Amino acid sequence: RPSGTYAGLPIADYGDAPPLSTKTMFWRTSPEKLPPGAWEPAYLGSKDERVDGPSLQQVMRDQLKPYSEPRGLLPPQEILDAVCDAIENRLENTLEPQKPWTFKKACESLDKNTSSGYPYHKQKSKDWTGSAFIGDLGDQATHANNMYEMGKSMRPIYTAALKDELVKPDKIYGKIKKRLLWGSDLGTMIRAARAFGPFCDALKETCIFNPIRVGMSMNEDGPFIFARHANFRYHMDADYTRWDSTQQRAILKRAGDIMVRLSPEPDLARVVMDDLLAPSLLDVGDYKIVVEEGLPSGCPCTTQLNSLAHWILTLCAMVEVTRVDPDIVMQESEFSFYGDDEVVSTNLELDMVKYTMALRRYGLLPTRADPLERRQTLQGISFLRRAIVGDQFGWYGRLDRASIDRQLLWTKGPNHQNPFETLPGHAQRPSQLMALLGEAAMHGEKYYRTVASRVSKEAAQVVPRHRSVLRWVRFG
């Protein structure tokens, strides 16, 4: 029955979503005071002692606004078609054909320590026997799977949440921001896993010679990835603001068509992709609202869809500007896409001003670093949280010290209301401490020493010498 607009978006029904969480999973590693400008867990609502801010619902409405903004322009249809053929073609020539996913495999693949979403909103593990969903979720899972096998449509219902994560302090103590998560319903997760699990698996296997890098290991795969990029003359590393909310469904639809066409049960996959990209029903608590545009997350094959969309858009811009055919562009370039993160290396003479304009024309908001700049060295180019570094031995991804120290101050634990509480006792995190030494080692012995000290100090409440970890971490 209900009508109107919530955060600029049409209301379609009453909502069933539980209330937004007021707790964080972050705990300080020490009771001492935080260094100034330190990152902290994002805002926790009216109950947050650190600051008096608006309601979580208001913070969520802020995040929903960009979804009602006008879309940018679709790329010129001929470029769009050639690019999409060229990307599909590239995948046909590289991906290993997969057998269908079983219902059993699909259910196994899901993360069992997160919510089931609409309508039970229970942690998946609570109806999971080890090998099958039973009880309530078993009924949802079974129904969804029957619909899948019958090629019948089902309207996903997403549940909005806000992301508990560390953030720069201005997002707590200034203008408060917190990231919108889209939380899928178990049924949609099942259908999506069955439909697209094969493609995603096939794609992960090619993460070194195909540009969708999802599933890569920074440590083991990065040096080969980065060495490939280095073979090309110009390097650029666009950063994008609000990638997800600025997507066009029409482009996501072209990405999806490629996924469907490269899946083992394409007729079944088609029904699922059409449900995923049909106007989206999102439960914000009081209301379920309809979101026609942007990317709907928590798919969970979304990161692939998104990366694929990114590949389409970047390539469309490049082709529009250089006028080189998309296949030849892939001969003369090396891409890395990981959702919204990009690295483009190319031999082509690319007009950076025109490239920036074409992306802005599509609705995207490219930004780096302080139009897009291109460099003749990969040194310093950013990828995920790393800086790409090269030396006599080769290339690697070095985590910035910011993130390193940040991991020294904060640890994960059970949800609580006050993030400045420390956990009692240990400090049960030896693996991370070592990895941190590793990450610190790549910064040189001077820095490694500092970090070694703190790591030792904390490990009190085997820490190797520098040259041995550095060797283990780069080569090992």
Residue from 166, 203, 378, 442 in contact with ligand 20V (CB under 6 A): 166
How many residues would you count in the chain?
476
Of 116-124, 259-267, 283-291, 403-411, which part binds ligand 20V (CB under 6 A)? 403-411
Stretch that binds ligand 20V, among 46-54, 65-73, 143-151, 407-415 (CB under 6 A): 407-415
Which residue in 108, 129, 125 sits closest to 116, CA to CA? 125
| Minimal distance, residue 113 CB to ligand 20V, in Å | 9
Peptide bond connecting 198 to the previous residue in cis, omega within 30 degrees of 0? no
The verdict on 57 binding ligand 20V (CB under 6 A) reads no
Q: How far is CA 375 from the centre of its chain?
A: 26
Nearer to ligand 20V, 207 or 272 (CB): 207
Question: Nearest to residue 160, comparing CAs of 6, 341, 2, 340?
Answer: 6
With beta carbons less than 8 A apart as the criterion, state whether 183 and 160 touch: yes
Q: Decide if residue 281 touches ligand 20V (CB under 6 A).
A: no
Tokens of 232: 């090309």
Give me the residues paired with residue 24 across strands.
416
Region from 168-176, 236-244, 257-265, 406-414 binding ligand 20V, contact rule CB under 6 A: 406-414
- Select 143 or 401, whichever has its Cβ closest to ligand 20V: 401
Which of 65, 152, 233, 412 touches ligand 20V (CB under 6 A)? 412
Q: Counting contacts by CB under 6 A, is residue 430 touching ligand 20V?
A: no
Alpha helices in 249-351 (DSSP H): 249-261, 266-277, 302-322, 326-331
Q: Does 27 bind ligand 20V (CB under 6 A)?
A: no
DSSP 458: H
Query: Measured between alpha carbons, how far is 101 from 149 in angstroms, rounded to an integer?
Result: 12
Q: Is 292 in the site for ligand 20V (CB under 6 A)?
A: no
Question: Given candidates 21, 403, 422, 450, which one binds ligand 20V under the rule CB under 6 A?
Answer: 403
Number of residues that bind ligand 20V (CB under 6 A): 13
Sole window of 95-103, 149-157, 369-377, 399-407 interacting with ligand 20V (rule: CB under 6 A): 399-407
Distance CA 166, CA 409 (A): 11
61 binds ligand 20V (CB under 6 A): no
Cα–Cα distances in Å, from 439 out to 22, 54, 86, 121, 435?
Answer: 33, 38, 38, 38, 6
Contact residues toward ligand 20V (CB under 6 A) are: 165-166, 216, 218, 384-386, 399, 403, 406-407, 410, 412
Binding site residue list for Mg(2+): 237, 239, 341-342, 382
